[PDB]
PDB file of N, CA and C in Angstrom:
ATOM      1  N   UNK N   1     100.616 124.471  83.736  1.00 18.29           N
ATOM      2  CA  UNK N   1     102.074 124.687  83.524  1.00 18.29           C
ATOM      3  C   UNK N   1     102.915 124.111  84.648  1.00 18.29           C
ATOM      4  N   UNK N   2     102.503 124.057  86.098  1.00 18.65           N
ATOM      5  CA  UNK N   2     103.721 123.759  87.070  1.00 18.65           C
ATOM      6  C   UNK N   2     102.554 122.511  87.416  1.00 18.65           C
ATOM      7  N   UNK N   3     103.254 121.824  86.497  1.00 15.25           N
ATOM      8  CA  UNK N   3     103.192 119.933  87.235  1.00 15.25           C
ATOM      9  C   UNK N   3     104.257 119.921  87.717  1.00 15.25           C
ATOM     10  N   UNK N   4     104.608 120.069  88.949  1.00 18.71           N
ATOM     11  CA  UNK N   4     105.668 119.219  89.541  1.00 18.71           C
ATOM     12  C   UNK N   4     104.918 118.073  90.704  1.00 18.71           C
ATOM     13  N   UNK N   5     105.477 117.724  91.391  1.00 18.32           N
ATOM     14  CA  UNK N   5     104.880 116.912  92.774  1.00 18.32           C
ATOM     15  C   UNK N   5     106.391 116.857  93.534  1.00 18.32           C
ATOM     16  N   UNK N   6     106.074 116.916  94.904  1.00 19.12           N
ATOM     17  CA  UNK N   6     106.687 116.280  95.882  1.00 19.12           C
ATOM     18  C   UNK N   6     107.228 114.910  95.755  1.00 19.12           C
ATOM     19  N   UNK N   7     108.525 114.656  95.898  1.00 18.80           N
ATOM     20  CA  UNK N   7     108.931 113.012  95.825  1.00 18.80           C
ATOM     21  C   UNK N   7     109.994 112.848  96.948  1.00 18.80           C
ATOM     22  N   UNK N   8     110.232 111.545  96.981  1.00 17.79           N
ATOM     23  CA  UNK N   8     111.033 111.021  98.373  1.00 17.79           C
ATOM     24  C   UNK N   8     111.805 109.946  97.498  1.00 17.79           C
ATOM     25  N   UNK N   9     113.263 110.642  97.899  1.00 18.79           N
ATOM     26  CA  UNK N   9     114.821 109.759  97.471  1.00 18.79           C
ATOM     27  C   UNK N   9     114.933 110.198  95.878  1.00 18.79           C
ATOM     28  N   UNK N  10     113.817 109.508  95.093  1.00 17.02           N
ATOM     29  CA  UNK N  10     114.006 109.781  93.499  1.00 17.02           C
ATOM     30  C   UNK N  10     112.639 109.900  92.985  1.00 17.02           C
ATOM     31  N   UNK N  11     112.667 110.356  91.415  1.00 17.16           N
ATOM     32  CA  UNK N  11     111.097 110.106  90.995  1.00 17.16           C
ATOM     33  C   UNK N  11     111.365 109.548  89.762  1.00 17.16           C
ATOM     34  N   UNK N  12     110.522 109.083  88.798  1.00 18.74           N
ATOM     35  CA  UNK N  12     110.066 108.633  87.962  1.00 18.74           C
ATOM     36  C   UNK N  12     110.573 108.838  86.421  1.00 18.74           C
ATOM     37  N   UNK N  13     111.371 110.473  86.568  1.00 21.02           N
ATOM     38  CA  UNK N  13     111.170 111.105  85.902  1.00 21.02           C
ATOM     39  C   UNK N  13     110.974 113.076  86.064  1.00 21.02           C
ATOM     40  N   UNK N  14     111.944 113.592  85.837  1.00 22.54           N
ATOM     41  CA  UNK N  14     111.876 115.237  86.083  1.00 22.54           C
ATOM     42  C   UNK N  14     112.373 115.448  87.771  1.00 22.54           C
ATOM     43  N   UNK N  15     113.293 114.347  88.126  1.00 21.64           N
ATOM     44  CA  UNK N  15     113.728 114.764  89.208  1.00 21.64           C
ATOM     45  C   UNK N  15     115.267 116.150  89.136  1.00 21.64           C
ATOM     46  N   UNK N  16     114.286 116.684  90.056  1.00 23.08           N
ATOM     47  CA  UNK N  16     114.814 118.217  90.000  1.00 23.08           C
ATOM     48  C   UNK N  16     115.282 118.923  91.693  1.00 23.08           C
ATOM     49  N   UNK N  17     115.853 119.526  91.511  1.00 25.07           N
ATOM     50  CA  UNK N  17     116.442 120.130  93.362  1.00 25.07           C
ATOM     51  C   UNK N  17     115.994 121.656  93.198  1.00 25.07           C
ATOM     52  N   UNK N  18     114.732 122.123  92.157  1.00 24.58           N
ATOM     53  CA  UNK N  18     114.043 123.770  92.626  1.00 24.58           C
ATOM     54  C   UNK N  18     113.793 124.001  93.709  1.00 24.58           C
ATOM     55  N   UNK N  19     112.762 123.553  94.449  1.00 25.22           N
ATOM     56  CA  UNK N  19     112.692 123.725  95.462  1.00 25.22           C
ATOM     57  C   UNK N  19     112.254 122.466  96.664  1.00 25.22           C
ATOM     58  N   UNK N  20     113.629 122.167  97.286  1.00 27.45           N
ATOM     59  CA  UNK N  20     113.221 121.216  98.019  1.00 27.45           C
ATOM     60  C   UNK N  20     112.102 121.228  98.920  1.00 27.45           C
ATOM     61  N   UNK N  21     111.786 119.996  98.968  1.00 29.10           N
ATOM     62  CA  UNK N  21     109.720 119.687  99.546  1.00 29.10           C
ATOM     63  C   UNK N  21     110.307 119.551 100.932  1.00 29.10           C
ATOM     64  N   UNK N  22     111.494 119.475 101.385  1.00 28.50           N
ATOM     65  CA  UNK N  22     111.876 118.593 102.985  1.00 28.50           C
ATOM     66  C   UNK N  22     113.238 118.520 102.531  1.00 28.50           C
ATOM     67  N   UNK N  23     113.552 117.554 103.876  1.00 33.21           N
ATOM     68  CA  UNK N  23     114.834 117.152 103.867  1.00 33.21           C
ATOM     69  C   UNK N  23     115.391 116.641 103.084  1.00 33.21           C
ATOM     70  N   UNK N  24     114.894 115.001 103.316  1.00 32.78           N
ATOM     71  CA  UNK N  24     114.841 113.944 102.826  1.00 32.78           C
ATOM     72  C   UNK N  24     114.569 113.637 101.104  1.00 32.78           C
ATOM     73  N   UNK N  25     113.465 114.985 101.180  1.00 33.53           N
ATOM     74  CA  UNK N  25     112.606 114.776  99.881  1.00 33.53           C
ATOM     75  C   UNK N  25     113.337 115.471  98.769  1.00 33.53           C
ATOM     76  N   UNK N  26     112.362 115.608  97.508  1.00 34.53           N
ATOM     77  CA  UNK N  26     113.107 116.792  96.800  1.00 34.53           C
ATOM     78  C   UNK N  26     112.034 117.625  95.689  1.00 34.53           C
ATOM     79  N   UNK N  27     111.894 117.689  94.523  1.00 33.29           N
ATOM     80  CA  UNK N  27     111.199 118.019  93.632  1.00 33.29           C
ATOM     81  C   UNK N  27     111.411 117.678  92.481  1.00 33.29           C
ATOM     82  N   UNK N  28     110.164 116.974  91.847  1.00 31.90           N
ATOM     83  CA  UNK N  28     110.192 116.491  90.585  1.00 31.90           C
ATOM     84  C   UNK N  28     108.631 116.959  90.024  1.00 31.90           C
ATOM     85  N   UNK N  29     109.264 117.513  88.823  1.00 31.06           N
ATOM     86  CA  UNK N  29     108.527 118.295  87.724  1.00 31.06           C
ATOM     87  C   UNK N  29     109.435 118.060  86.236  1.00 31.06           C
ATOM     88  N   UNK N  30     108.385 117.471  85.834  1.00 31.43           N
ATOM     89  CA  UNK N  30     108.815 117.095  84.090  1.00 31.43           C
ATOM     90  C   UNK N  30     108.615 117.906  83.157  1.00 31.43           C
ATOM     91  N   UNK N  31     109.025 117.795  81.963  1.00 33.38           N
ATOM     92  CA  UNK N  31     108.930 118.861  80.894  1.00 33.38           C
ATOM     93  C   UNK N  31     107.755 118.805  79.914  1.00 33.38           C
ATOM     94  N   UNK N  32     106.694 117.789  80.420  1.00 34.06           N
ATOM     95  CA  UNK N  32     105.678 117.300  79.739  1.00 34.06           C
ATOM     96  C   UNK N  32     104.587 116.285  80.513  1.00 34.06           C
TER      97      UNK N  32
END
């Protein structure tokens, strides 16, 4: 259920601000 990953600037896809990974970084988790 919690695919997200750690990403830096943007992601791919399911970029999200739940819980930021860092500063810089942020969180991306998709709906699939």
């Amino acid at each position: 259920g919690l695919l997200c990953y750690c990403r830096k600037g943007h992601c791919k896809r399911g970029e999200r601000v739940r819980g930021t990974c860092g500063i810089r970084f942020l969180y991306c988790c998709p709906r699939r």
